[PDB]
Design a protein around this nucleic acid. Structure first.
Lengths: 47, 74, 34, 67
RNA sequence: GUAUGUCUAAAGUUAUGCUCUUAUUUACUAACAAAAUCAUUGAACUAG
RNA sequence: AAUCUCUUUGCCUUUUGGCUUAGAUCAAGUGUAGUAUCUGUUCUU
């Protein structure tokens, strides 16, 4: 099932995956970071 | 991947010095310049404003660069 | 936020500020999706 | 034709349903609210601690100013 | 579908809690697949 | 005067090996299959 508008509330699990992802990919690969999150976009992960 | 590497040292010409060469004739090595040269021996009062009332050694901030950017980016 | 507090949404709404909100805790049963 | 239309309608419905996480569930609104209301509880408690002694400040001031 | 790589195997004889049964979820991969509304027409076609 | 183990100091001893337009763009998919995987239930223990 497709997801055309992403977002919603940030859960703790998403924040923890984002932090682990940043520790690996740095802060200039937001698409690679967001790729680990199902409901958030690159720009939302950067924000 | 390790295939993408910086150069640790440049290849020395001493290696080629030991190789046995071939007889290829290169276009740029054909005869040319075969002889050496040698030296001898009221309308103006109604407005709110009016008269009635470098070089630096840094390309990215030189006026030349700024006017280049103003000219090519619009 | 501080300026507002110094001068003194709803179900089905879009939150424009979601990226600045506090994280929703993980309740002990993680959903299969997560 | 009626079948194919009804099934595209149902699958569109599933998509519209799947995107419901983008909105604030009542459980999200309540979760923020408690943080607001327990923040206001903290503010009340701290302010009560401050003014429960701020009124008595003058009585101790007089006692200390005696000697 | 390529580039490209690998294989091909006797004889032509060199002297001495933790799992299981099994019904699902999720991800990845598949030049596999002629899929019924929107006088019969995607149709042998796409590769760094 | 000679062992053994601690602790600090020193040594870092498997201790990020280039370049360009962050090199570029993408991350919506049916059936069946393949591989991994998940909950549960008995069973193993």
């Amino acid at each position: 099932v497709p997801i055309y508008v992403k977002g919603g509330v940030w859960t703790n699990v998403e924040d923890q995956i984002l932090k682990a992802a940043v520790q690996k990919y740095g802060t200039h690969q937001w698409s690679k970071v967001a790729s680990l999150l199902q409901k958030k976009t690159a720009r939302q992960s950067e924000l | 991947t390790t295939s993408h590497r910086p150069q640790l040292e440049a290849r020395s010409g001493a290696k080629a010095a030991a190789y046995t060469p071939t007889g290829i004739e290169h276009a740029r090595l054909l005869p040319g310049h075969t002889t050496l040269k040698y030296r001898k021996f009221s309308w103006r009062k109604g407005t709110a404003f009016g008269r009635h009332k470098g070089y630096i050694n840094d390309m990215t901030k030189s006026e030349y660069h700024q006017e280049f950017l103003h000219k090519h980016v619009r | 936020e501080r300026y507002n507090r110094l001068l003194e949404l709803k179900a089905g709404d879009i939150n424009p500020n979601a990226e600045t909100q506090m994280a929703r805790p993980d309740n002990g049963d993680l959903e299969d999706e997560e | 034709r009626s079948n194919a239309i009804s099934k595209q309608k149902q699958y569109n419905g599933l998509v519209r349903d799947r995107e419901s996480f983008t909105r604030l569930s009542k459980e999200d609104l309540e979760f923020y609210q408690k943080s607001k209301n327990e923040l206001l509880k903290k503010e009340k408690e701290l302010n009560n601690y401050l003014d429960v002694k701020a009124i008595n400040f003058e009585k101790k001031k007089k006692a200390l100013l005696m000697e």
